[PDB]
Amino acid sequence: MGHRTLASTPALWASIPCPRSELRLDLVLPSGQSFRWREQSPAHWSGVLADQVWTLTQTEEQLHCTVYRGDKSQASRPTPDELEAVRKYFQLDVTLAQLYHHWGSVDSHFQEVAQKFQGVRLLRQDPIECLFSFICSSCNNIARITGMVERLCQAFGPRLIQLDDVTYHGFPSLQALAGPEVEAHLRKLGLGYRARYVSASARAILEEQGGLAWLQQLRESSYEEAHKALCILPGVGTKVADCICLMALDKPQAVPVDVHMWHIAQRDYSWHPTTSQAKGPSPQTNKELGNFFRSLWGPYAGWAQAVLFSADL
DNA sequence: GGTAGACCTGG
DNA sequence: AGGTCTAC
Ligand SMILES: [Ca+2]
Ligand SMILES: [Ca+2]
Ligand SMILES: [Ca+2]
Ligand SMILES: [Ca+2]
């Protein structure tokens, strides 16, 4: 049959209690957090989650999930253990109603816009996927990032299943990305200079930093200590490190600063740098702007940012 | 020690 | 969407 819909094969879906006010798929899944989610049917989002493929759709009160067991298994509704993977991914224990309240309390501007854009939360992503996706994000549009990431997974990622005319692949290992002649191969896939960064970082982690554990144990480390460590890797500067911290390493206070931020900082908040004499973006001033919004929104500043970014782009 | 080049490209 | 490395 291939890609399932809620109407098409109703016995195969299981529901996770979640109102649209807590999660809007259409606002989080395509919004440049993950690049590997596709809306194959209208309102149905298919992607790879915990090394299986899932199709997600939502009604007013429920989030509907189905998982694609292969030719190995018979068709089954998602198990409670399987569904806890989905819950974990979307970090539903974090309650947006409460966060939106707190942000709207201490920021009148937020109140105005966040009323229109609810359900904008942050995914908890695998650090590897996240790192390499955002290494490729340098000087890059979401569309081209999406293609680069997709091509990279087809090339070096294990085959999961085929639905319709789409072959879902897992995100590649450090071993695959550290393999010989990978950079050359990735250039043929049009990553450009990012090809060198992918290979160099995969090798840097495996051969110098002590492997996958190093990257994963940056979850337990502080935001300060995790950011310093990521920046050692080739291709990883301040902005990429903040993205990884915020989307993979459980640092909600991380505020990745780009010119989009500055536009928002000036238009909406009328913000000027005080410490640095420089009036434009720099290492000093971006450090301020991150601190400013952490001061303004507090520990979940990064999540609050996402509501504003999802309002514009 | 904050700034102006090169790096890839789809344009 | 447009950041990271290198250079003085
Ligand atoms: Ca994995
Ligand atoms: Ca199953
Ligand atoms: Ca794929
Ligand atoms: Ca670096």
Numbering used by the authors: 11 to 323
Please share excerpts from the published article on this structure.
Co-crystal structures of a base-excision DNA-repair enzyme (human 8-oxo­guanine DNA glycosylase; hOgg1) in complex with a photocaged 8-oxoguanine DNA lesion were determined before and after uncaging via illumination at 2.81 and 2.48 Å resolution, respectively. GIC is not catalytically competent, as the potential base is hosted within an exosite. Only upon recognition of damage at the GIC stage is the nucleotide loaded into the active site, where oG was first excised, followed by cleavage of the DNA backbone via β-elimination [Fig. 1(a)].
Thus, in the strategy designed by Lee and coworkers, which relies on the crystallization of fully active, cross-linked oG*–DNA–hOgg1 complexes, steric hindrance due to the photolabile protecting group in oG* prevented active-site loading, arresting the reaction cycle at the GIC stage. Here, it is reasonable to assume that the bulky O6-NPP group which prevents the entry of oG into the active site also precludes binding to the exosite. Clearly, the recovered DNA contained oG* in addition to the N4-modified cytosines (C†) without observing the uncaged oG oligo­nucleotide, showing the integrity of the DNA in the G*O co-crystals. Crystal photosensitivity was tested by exposing fragmented crystals to 365 nm LED light for 10 s at varying energy doses, followed immediately by flash-cooling and data collection. Here, the exposure of G*O co-crystals to light clearly affected the crystal diffraction power [Fig. 2(d)], with dark crystals diffracting to ∼2.7 Å resolution. However, the observed illumination-dependent loss of diffraction power by G*Odark suggests the enticing possibility of directly observing hOgg1-catalyzed DNA cleavage at the oG site, which leads to a single-strand break.
